[PDB]
Write a protein that binds this ligand. Structure first.
Ligand SMILES: Cc1cc2nc3c(=O)[nH]c(=O)nc-3n(C[C@H](O)[C@H](O)[C@H](O)COP(=O)(O)OP(=O)(O)OC[C@H]3O[C@@H](n4cnc5c(N)ncnc54)[C@H](O)[C@@H]3O)c2cc1C
Ligand SMILES: Cc1cc2nc3c(=O)[nH]c(=O)nc-3n(C[C@H](O)[C@H](O)[C@H](O)COP(=O)(O)OP(=O)(O)OC[C@H]3O[C@@H](n4cnc5c(N)ncnc54)[C@H](O)[C@@H]3O)c2cc1C
Ligand SMILES: NC(=O)c1ccc[n+]([C@@H]2O[C@H](COP(=O)([O-])OP(=O)(O)OC[C@H]3O[C@@H](n4cnc5c(N)ncnc54)[C@H](OP(=O)(O)O)[C@@H]3O)[C@@H](O)[C@H]2O)c1
Ligand SMILES: NC(=O)c1ccc[n+]([C@@H]2O[C@H](COP(=O)([O-])OP(=O)(O)OC[C@H]3O[C@@H](n4cnc5c(N)ncnc54)[C@H](OP(=O)(O)O)[C@@H]3O)[C@@H](O)[C@H]2O)c1
Ligand SMILES: [Cl-]
Ligand SMILES: [Cl-]
Lengths: 443, 443
């Protein structure tokens, strides 16, 4: 019996780690093959200067940029089976830069010895399910050998992420505008916008952080514009929030204010779409970005074909943590440890979760909900229980530190829920920490 | 009997025109379905401000930019069945802007009434050939309905182009550089580089023209770097050619000169790759960009499966013209008018064309070769013969005007080979024609 794992970001890495853990405790595991289009693992966390399409012509995956740091508390994404203490050997602050968390997630799978299951530089083209043999044919392109080939699997776990294919709306006059227009997905070095005026269309995490990054590295002026409601924070002197963009000139932007501004560049921070070009409608998840997509029993088993799974397709307050709980659950169903109920029962269960999701009003209610979801998963499994209510509270602190001051939220510290140890303050306040390297953060 | 045409650029447009022409002369034609991922026809010639991935997540197709004009004589790409005189009603100059040639190619297919065969906003996912039924299954995603479906065809003609998926080599230090790095494919408005220093990596048509465009719209400084040999032309005061880039700094570029320069942005003009993600190895053309790719009988019939065709996959001195000769040939084989020889004979014929291709040294020998190729095609077909040697000579003039002065080559005029009428001088010299619109060019 044979499993295909699509992708080697945190989620695929988690899926390999789950099986390896079960084998380490003496269980007999299926054969595993994992396909990844990049040359190395880490998903989003593997930085690249590339843009649009990669060296092989596949859409560039990572949306990450220079100077990116964790945007939530480290301790809200710690692995229950592999702690920050184990990995780094010393305590570190709470909002590590990209390279540091990349080093961290690699460390777990390095220790586990699961690299050997991965075929890198290989893009998944198609997954078909055969009624007759009751198996999946996965067709891939190996860009090392420039060969296209297919292989047969009994179950498939899709871990290809949903923050990679941009949602890019059009505004009137974009075809006339003289400056750069880009989506957040293409943002790389904040220095390219030094001494320039940047319009940021959108009001979520990308808007906040890309603006923050441009501010930090010396842009002249920043303008956020919002669709429904204002971001709400106290922005520095050279950053305004305006109602939505309506049109654009050779050099100006016009808003629902009636106001006007000369603008050098426009960065669309409008989010992403769930896009699976390697799947037909029988297997293909269709959803907007939300806490409870439909058709996923326990949020991971595909209801129209329960031998196909999805990891991490929910919107994210929790992350690494959650993928783990998902991957452990996926594995125990694949291994026959947790038999699936009937299709009617699955659908009724998923309806209950959707009813509750539509109930949610406040940030607190939302991550508490994801908290409840994760709790339900970890209770069914091998995976070590940890203090979820206490993680929720850590989120609550985090939200407060953002309300207090949006530029200084990364200068606070929190208690690890795995080890119990309060994180130290970092050696340099965020505003002044211009060097984003692992090197400089750990020294 | 039923045909699938993949793409509605010049080539797919030509393929539909070919069939329509045969029906207009009273022949019974097959059913035609043409699939196009954009919302309108024209291929490269349909401009978009978009970059990387389009509103549906498909790779953005067009490589074209603001202010692009024909880079060869108009009269070298005139349709033999639909003249510039017929379309515009007046004589026009010889290097029309993008919008003008777009208007022109649309005109032929507007007159022909072939739009009705096209499914726009539909991306081709996969083409399989079935041994049992001797037919092709084409799977597509309709982004209007968000549905994925498949349909059966007896022959397939692939017209998806080969100047869209960038070849993007890496140079040391790109992950440290502070400015924008982009491939020519992502170049949009030359105004974004006003008063800046731009490095152009490459030594072909994109290098020449993107530099030219940046110069024309007010860049501070330009640097071309070449892999094998220098471009050769006399560049204006603020533009140097130096040997290849070796590495890059936070803000500087270093060359095999040993020389150094502060640089604001890097535009890789390093060309494209043949990429067909919708095809398996049984159907998939693998080739570098050249005058005579292998495995294409008469340069269009796929030798391992002669019910599958390729249009326009050769490198291009001729263009529109050539696609016509190819499409007319494809059609006459599909229609049984020109029976295919045996596989051995096809391979031997292709070998002879390859032998000759490797003989070619000079620009003149090269386009004369493609001229001979086109001649061989049009003699086998319905398609009106026209003076190819005289078109060759028009290319020769064109090359001379480029050697004379690379910035003024677009200010010359040539004799139409269809109508025989010398083109008038344009109303504004190229350097001063800042407005790129159809509107402004025809007034
Ligand atoms: C800019 C940005 C910043 C973020 N910052 C944080 C943060 O600070 N903290 C946090 O908790 N979360 C953050 N996230 C959320 C992020 O989704 C998770 O941290 C995590 O990366 C999810 O991992 P994943 O493996 O499920 O998806 P991904 O990390 O996207 O991995 C998907 C993998 O699948 C591969 N793949 C996709 N298609 C194919 C194909 N056809 N064939 C082969 N391989 C394929 C990709 O190469 C990739 O490796 C951020 C997300 C973005 C976009
Ligand atoms: C920047 C640039 C400038 C150029 N300038 C000139 C010039 O001045 N003069 C000249 O003679 N030639 C020029 N060319 C050469 C150009 O190749 C031809 O002029 C002509 O555009 C080739 O047409 P085509 O139909 O064969 O390919 P394309 O024009 O590229 O059309 C291919 C079509 O297939 C579609 N497609 C691709 N994949 C899919 C899919 N999977 N599903 C559905 N549809 C798909 C695309 O949307 C596109 O419409 C230029 C090329 C480039 C890149
Ligand atoms: N580590 C980091 O610092 C960091 C940085 C960036 C991103 N990320 C991660 O990336 C993920 C997504 O971040 P995200 O903000 O890009 O996606 P997102 O959370 O879905 O944000 C979507 C935003 O786009 C806006 N939008 C959509 N259409 C619009 C339109 N037509 N006009 C104006 N606005 C429009 C939405 O407006 P409405 O609110 O009105 O619907 C919303 O503000 C998150 O997990 C986040 O953690 C992390
Ligand atoms: N209408 C217009 O004005 C216009 C503008 C742009 C493009 N186009 C069209 O687009 C098509 C392609 O033009 P193109 O120039 O982008 O593709 P191209 O003609 O294949 O040019 C390829 C170039 O990339 C260079 N290159 C490849 N790898 C390199 C490396 N590692 N380092 C440095 N240089 C490298 C090659 O160097 P080598 O020479 O050593 O091999 C060559 O100079 C042509 O049909 C052209 O008509 C038209
Ligand atoms: Cl272990
Ligand atoms: Cl007609």
């Amino acid at each position: 019996t044979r499993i295909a794992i699509l992708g080697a970001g945190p989620s695929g890495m988690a899926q390999l780690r789950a099986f390896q853990s079960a084998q380490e405790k003496g269980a007999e595991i299926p054969e595993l093959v994992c396909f990844e289009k990049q040359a190395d693992w880490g998903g989003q966390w593997n930085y690249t200067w590339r843009t649009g399409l990669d060296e092989n012509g596949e859409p560039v995956h990572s949306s990450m940029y220079r100077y990116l740091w964790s945007n939530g508390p480290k301790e809200c994404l710690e692995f229950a089976d592999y702690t920050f203490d184990e990995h780094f050997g010393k305590p570190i602050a709470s909002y590590p830069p990209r390279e540091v968390l990349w080093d961290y997630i690699k460390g777990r799978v390095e220790k586990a010895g699961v690299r050997k299951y991965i075929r890198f530089n290989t893009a998944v083209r198609h997954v078909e399910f055969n009624e007759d043999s009751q198996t999946f044919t996965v067709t891939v392109q190996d860009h090392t050998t420039d060969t296209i080939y297919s292989a047969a699997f009994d179950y498939v776990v899709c871990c290809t992420g949903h923050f990679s294919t941009p949602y890019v709306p059009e505004f009137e006059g974009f075809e006339k505008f003289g400056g750069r227009i880009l989506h957040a997905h293409d943002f790389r070095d904040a220095l390219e916008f030094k001494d320039k005026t940047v319009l940021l269309v959108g009001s979520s995490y990308s808007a906040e952080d890309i603006g923050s990054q441009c501010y930090k590295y010396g842009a002249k002026k920043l303008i956020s514009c919002y669709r429904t409601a204002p971001m709400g924070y106290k922005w520095p002197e050279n950053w305004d929030e305006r109602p939505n963009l309506v049109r654009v000139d050779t050099e100006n932007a016009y808003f629902a204010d009636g106001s006007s501004e000369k603008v050098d560049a426009i960065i669309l921070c409008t989010g992403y779409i769930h896009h699976f070009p390697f799947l037909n409608d029988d297997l293909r998840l269709v959803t907007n970005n939300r806490l409870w997509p439909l058709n996923l029993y326990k949020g991971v088993v595909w209801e129209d074909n329960p031998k196909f799974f999805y990891i991490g397709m929910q919107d994210q307050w929790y992350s690494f943590n959650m993928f783990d709980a998902q991957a452990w659950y996926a594995r125990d169903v694949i291994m026959g440890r947790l038999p699936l109920p009937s299709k009617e029962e699955m659908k009724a269960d998923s309806m209950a979760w959707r009813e509750k999701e539509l109930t949610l009003v406040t940030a607190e209610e939302m991550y508490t909900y994801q908290g409840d979801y994760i709790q339900n998963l970890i209770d069914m499994t091998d995976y070590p229980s940890f203090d979820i209510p206490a993680t929720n509270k850590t989120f609550l602190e985090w939200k407060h530190h953002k309300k207090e001051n949006i530029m200084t939220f990364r200068d606070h510290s929190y208690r690890s829920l795995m080890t119990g140890t309060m994180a130290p303050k970092h050696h340099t306040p965020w505003i002044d920490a211009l060097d984003d390297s692992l090197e400089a953060y750990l020294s």
